[PDB]
Each structure stands twice: as structure tokens, then as C-alpha cells.
Write a protein that binds this ligand. Structure first.
Ligand SMILES: Cc1ncc(COP(=O)(O)O)c(CN[C@H](CCC(=O)O)C(=O)O)c1O
Ligand SMILES: Cc1ncc(COP(=O)(O)O)c(CN[C@H](CCC(=O)O)C(=O)O)c1O
Lengths: 396, 396
């Protein structure tokens, strides 16, 4: 039976880590997967996290199953982070949050939930976008359409093309938005643009689905949440899939949340029971460790102050690297203007390189980037910056 | 869009956990969820586990993404436990193992893998079986069919009704088998019977899918895999979904594995690539903590030895309770013979109690059991034995 199975190609992002760990030429540089690295080129576990893990080691007395929707405090803390402490959505209890296995896990339960319990037939995702978005929704039988987003000429948001592109998005259709730090462009809407979209969304009757994987990597925790909060203030229903993989450096512990919002408590509770059913038929209940760490940190003011500082330091080093990247490109002889990089938010930067050039950097200079030209700025250091820029320049 | 979603019914097993936690009675007894309890009625963290966690805390340097199929050593360690160190399967590199979030997650990926890449349309599950089996398969789009298995009149396995039932299973169909400690009956086939079903399996042309969540709870690690091993020696292809929730007391860390077996190394690798695709579109990659604990214990002879001792102690305590349960029932004046209970394997026991009786135990006596009459013997202790048996006799 397994003979008739056709091999699947490598993941355009995770496949990368395999090739990288394979070639043996010295000096190779990895700018693929979206993981943070400090100035030494390592992805350390945060201090606040190590602290929380010791607390857990000392006070944990059982690994007994969590409820299908996870740790109660985890759910509460994520809603405050998303909508704000005094938020009306919370006070009126219009939101229920399920702890999931990473941001990916949250998108999948949201997809299963929609496919099996609603009349949703189509999901609109930005072009370009995180590659796995289409795979997740397709796995639930949902048709995925794309809408315009990036102005490849001006290196800005093509807002007119975006609006025009979504003209055919029907009422009942789901529209996917990146909370902040758009992957892979690094270009997010302004608050005014978010407000325009929120209004457009209600009038057309779209079901907004927010992918929030980098809260705090643009400007700050609250600031990065402005777009989402502009929608939540005007929408009856909406879904937000968030991830703690990045802002807590907990990649492999798989910590995420799928937050469901309905018109009133009675409706959200009813629909949430169906979401739990979807979870039960998938992985049953969520892994405790990562989520426990997070709930511990967000609940203790001492740890919370620590973590916030560590997050601030990560954001800052990334921005510092962005300026260093542009300066060194010039220094090494690039005639093309890369100033636009300084305007992009988050870990990534859409370089502009072509699939041909990205392939040259890899096989010829041992520099790894994703085939779409996306390069991970969080992976650049004062030590590989020069070799890196010299490679890019040689391929331009 | 969420206005007309009908509420879902509570899970027949996880739902009870909520009712129990809420129950105000101070004398309430929990025999519902399949969770182990020690002599004091607690679900402790194994000492082997606690030590492994201590190591991880002081030696883990990064939380970097853990590869789609998880920790390599983990995969290798689960293959030896399932097939034996010097297995031809392992030597001929015919097996590929993916670390998954629990046994349930392993079952879901297998289902997604089959529905998306093969011609498989129906899965055969024993009647009775774990209630969530049907839910996992229906969710992936597969239809679920039941085969006879239990002789309620003799509290024994109906080998003739079983084989007479699977006659309707066409070629290309999947048949679900419980490695050992069948849930909820506790009655497993003898090696002889395993030999038969195996040969019958290859002949009728079925794809065997084993659910292995209790390895070590029937007789021992090696002994409980006999049935599986008999199948592996004859089949070209097979799927095994295992769990470490129970034998490592790591329920909430979600530690399981999905193992694919094919005719040769070329075929399995090609097939495994699609399984990784199914995983990538579900939760992307597995949670490291739980899996890391198992890997470090199974890899360290000293820890390994401690763990096996603890597992032996859990198994024997359950057997002791099994015997005590039957002796106490008579002592309390049971109007029947529960001698068959001594012949059951694992954590459970199919009491024979009716749904009405089970409801009565909960409401009037605060004793919680599954509505199917399944009782968790591992949840019984020298302290709650008397109150418990008095409750059952009162409903008899
Ligand atoms: C927009 C976006 N959504 C969801 C996720 C999923 O997060 P989690 O790992 O919690 O499930 C990522 C991770 N960004 C990827 C990391 C590697 C990958 O999974 O491809 C990246 O853009 O490199 C992401 O950028
Ligand atoms: C046959 C069987 N398969 C799969 C599982 C899944 O285990 P994991 O938690 O690794 O995904 C269990 C757990 N036995 C259940 C535990 C509670 C539940 O999930 O219903 C039980 O029968 O009580 C099981 O008995």
C-alpha cells in the first residue's frame, strides 16, 4: 500500500536546517529558520524561563492530565496580553482561550473547528506569507485564496492593491491577518490602515483570523497589539492564534493559544465546546511544561519584569543588526540601495534577492536563506556580518 | 457565524474529571480517568522522571525547534522497546518513528497520513474500545467499523465472534489492535491467538494499526510486545501508535510516538516524508520536555534501572488492588462473583455494572466510574477500598 505513495518535497523553511547541518564547509552562515540568536550566535533559554523551570521542578507533584483547554491561568494571561487588562471583551466574557501546541497548533484547531462547525469554505491569506499557512488550512479541507500585500517596487505596503484584491472576499469568508511583524515582508499596516481594514471587514462581513506570533518584536507588547484591538472593538466574532515560541524563546516546548471571540458569553461558551471536541480528536490535551513556564512568569511580577527586559533586549539587538546590515552592505560595495530594510519590523527582512541568487549564496558562499529571499536578521552577528555582506555583494 | 453552533456533549471520560473536581462531597472516589495512583491516592511524578528533569534543567542550553519528527534518540529508543534490540526491522532500516504529542496525537497523525496519502477508507475498531478512537478516525475523514470482541456472558474474549466479524473486512482496510491491556475490557488475546490473527491478517490483506499505551502493565516490557512482534515478523507494512503517558507517568507532557513500517528502506522513507507533511500541517513539531525525559532515562542504564523498578512496582500494586477488590466485594456482601476481575490485565476492569448503576454510584455515593462500567483499579487504595465496595454492593 505504501508503494503508491508519492514522496513529499522538503519544507521550504525547516528543510533548510537539514541542509545547513549537512554541508561541511567552514564559515557557513544560517539565515533561514526564524529563531533568535544573541551576539554569540546562540539561541539561549531566557533567564526568566530557567527561573520558572526551577520553580516547577521544586513545586510540581504530579503530571496528571490537564483539561482539554489547558491551564486556566494561561488562558487568562493570554487574553490580557491580547486585549488589555481592563478590556471589555474580558469583562463581558466574550472570549475563551484554549492552550495549544504552538502557534501552528492554534491555527490547526481553528481550521478544524471552522471546517466542521461553520459554513466557512474559504480562507484568504496574504501573498506572500508564511508558507505553512496554506498547508494548515488545506489540511482541514478549506480552500485558500491569496490577496495582494507587498509593493515590490517601493518596498512598502500596497494598500490599494490589497483593498482591490479583497473585493471578492464574501461575507462568511475568513481573512487572515498578521498581528505585527508580517512574515516575510516585515511590513505591517499603520494604525490608520488597521482602522480602515477593521471597518471594511465589518461592512463586508468577514470573519477575522489573526496570527500573532511576534507580539512585542515590533514596538512593544501593547503597541504591537493595536491593530488587533482596533478589530476587536468593532467585531462581534474573531479568532486569534497566538504563539509564545518567539517572545519567550520556547520554540520546542510548543506554547500557543487559540482565542475565540463571540458576541456574548452564552454563544462563545457553546462554540468553544465544539472547539474542545476538535482538540480531543487531535492531541487530546496540551503539553504542560512550556505553558506552565509562561503562566508562571506572567503571574509573578518579579519574573514578569525580568522577561520584559529580556524581550526588550532581543528586539533592540535585532534593530541594531538591521542598521549594521545596511551599513556594511554599503561598506562592502553594494550599489543597490537597501535602506528599506530599516523600515521593516520583526526578525525577517525581505532582501529582494532572486531564487537564483539565494541558491548561489548557499552553494557558492555557504550562506543560507529561504528561497523567497527572506533573511533572518536575528541570526546576524557582529562576527558574521562582514562575511555575509561580502557574499551578498558578490551575487548582486 | 457562531450563532447556530450546537453545543457538544461532554467527553465520556475527560468530562467526568470536571464533575469530580466540582463534586463537593469530601468522601468522593475517582475511578474514572486511566491515571495511576500510589498507596496514598496520589498520582506522583516518578523519581526517575524527577531526576531526568533535574539534569535537563542544569544542562539544557537551548529551546531551539526540535525537528518535525522530534528527538532522534527518542525514536531509536521506542523502536527497541517495540521490536527488541536485535530486530530485523531495525537492522533492515524498515521502520521510521515520529515523536508525537501523546498516544492520541500519534493516532491522529496516522489517520491524517492514511486519509491524505492512501486509498484507505475504513478503520476497524473492537467493540468495545476507547471511545475517542472513533472520534480520531472520523475526524480525519475515515469511516469507523466495529468488530465483535467481548463475551459479556463469560467475561472472556470471543475469538470466534471476533474472527467471524473481521471476515467483512475487505483488503486495504485498516484494523485497530490493542497491543496489551485492552481498554476497557482488560482481556487480551493469547500468543496463540496473536499468531492466528497475524497469519489471518496477512492473508486477508489488512493494514494492522496497533494502539500501544500500556506496555509493561500486563506482564513486562518484552512480554507485552509479543503480539505486536508476531505481527512484525509476518507483515510488510504496519503502523504502531504508542504512548508514554502511563508507563512514565507523564500524562500532561504529551509523550507518544507513531511508527511506520514498510516493505523496505526506500518505501518507508518515501512514505515517512508524507507523514512529516501531515505533522507539519498539524502542530509543526513535537514538544521537547516530555520526550527529552524519556530519552535521557532510556539512554542512561542507571536511570533505566530505576525506572523499570518503578514500573514493576506500579504493575504489582495494581495486581494487589485487583485481588483486594475481589476479596473486599465478597466481604461487603456482594450478591455475585467478581472472580473474572482477577483475569483482567492493566489498569481497568469491566465491572459489569450498568449505566443506571454507574449513575447511581456517582450521584448517591460520590463514586465516579465510566458509564460503560469501566473502573480504574489503579485508582483504588487500601483506604478507599471499603467505602468503594460498600457503594457497589448497595447498587447491586
Ligand atoms: C506567521 C507565523 N505563524 C506561525 C508560526 C508558527 O509558530 P510556532 O512555531 O509556535 O508553531 C511562525 C513561526 N515562524 C517560522 C519558524 C519555523 C517554521 O515553523 O517555519 C519562520 O517563519 O521561520 C510564524 O512566523
Ligand atoms: C487505548 C488507549 N489509547 C490511547 C490513549 C491515549 O493516551 P495519551 O494520553 O497518550 O494520548 C489511552 C489513554 N487512556 C485514557 C486516558 C484519558 C483519556 O484520554 O480518555 C483512559 O482510557 O482513561 C488509551 O487507553
Amino acid at each position: 500500500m505504501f508503494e503508491n505513495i508519492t514522496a513529499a518535497p522538503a519544507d521550504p523553511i525547516l528543510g533548510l536546517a537539514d541542509l545547513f547541518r549537512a554541508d561541511e564547509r567552514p564559515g557557513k552562515i544560517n539565515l533561514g529558520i526564524g529563531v533568535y540568536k544573541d551576539e554569540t550566535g546562540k539561541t539561549p533559554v531566557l533567564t526568566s524561563v530557567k527561573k520558572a523551570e526551577q520553580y516547577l521542578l521544586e513545586n510540581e507533584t504530579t503530571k496528571n492530565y490537564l483539561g482539554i483547554d489547558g491551564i486556566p491561568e494561561f488562558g487568562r494571561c493570554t487574553q490580557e496580553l491580547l486585549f488589555g487588562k481592563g478590556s471589555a471583551l474580558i469583562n463581558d466574557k466574550r472570549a475563551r482561550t484554549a492552550q495549544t501546541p504552538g502557534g501552528t497548533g492554534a491555527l490547526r484547531v481553528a481550521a478544524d473547528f471552522l471546517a466542521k462547525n461553520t459554513s466557512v469554505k474559504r480562507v484568504w491569506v496574504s501573498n506572500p506569507s508564511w508558507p505553512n499557512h496554506k498547508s494548515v488550512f488545506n489540511s482541514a479541507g478549506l480552500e485558500v485564496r491569496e490577496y495582494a500585500y507587498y509593493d515590490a517596487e517601493n518596498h512598502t505596503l500596497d494598500f490599494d492593491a490589497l483593498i482591490n484584491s479583497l473585493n471578492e472576499a464574501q461575507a462568511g469568508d475568513v481573512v487572515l491577518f498578521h498581528g505585527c511583524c508580517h512574515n516575510p515582508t516585515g511590513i505591517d499596516p499603520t494604525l490608520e490602515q488597521w482602522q480602515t481594514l477593521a471597518q471594511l471587514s465589518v461592512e463586508k462581513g468577514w470573519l477575522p483570523l489573526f496570527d500573532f506570533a511576534y507580539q512585542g518584536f515590533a514596538r512593544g507588547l501593547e503597541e504591537d497589539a493595536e491593530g488587533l484591538r482596533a478589530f476587536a472593538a468593532m467585531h462581534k466574532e474573531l479568532i486569534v492564534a497566538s504563539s509564545y515560541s518567539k517572545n519567550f524563546g520556547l520554540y520546542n516546548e510548543r506554547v500557543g493559544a487559540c482565542t475565540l471571540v463571540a458576541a456574548d458569553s452564552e454563544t462563545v461558551d457553546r462554540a468553544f465546546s465544539q472547539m474542545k471536541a476538535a482538540i480531543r480528536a487531535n492531541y487530546s490535551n496540551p503539553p504542560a511544561h512550556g505553558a506552565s513556564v509562561v503562566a508562571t512568569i506572567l503571574s509573578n511580577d518579579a519574573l514578569r519584569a525580568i522577561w520584559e527586559q529580556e524581550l526588550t533586549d532581543m528586539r533592540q539587538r535585532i534593530q541594531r543588526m538591521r542598521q549594521l546590515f545596511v551599513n556594511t552592505l554599503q561598506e562592502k560595495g553594494a550599489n543597490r540601495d537597501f535602506s528599506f530594510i530599516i523600515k521593516q519590523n520583526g526578525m525577517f527582512s525581505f532582501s529582494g534577492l532572486t531564487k537564483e541568487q539565494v541558491l548561489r549564496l548557499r552553494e557558492e558562499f555557504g550562506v543560507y536563506a529561504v528561497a523567497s529571499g527572506r533573511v533572518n536578521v536575528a541570526g546576524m552577528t557582529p562576527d558574521n556580518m562582514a562575511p555575509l555582506c561580502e557574499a551578498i555583494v558578490a551575487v548582486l
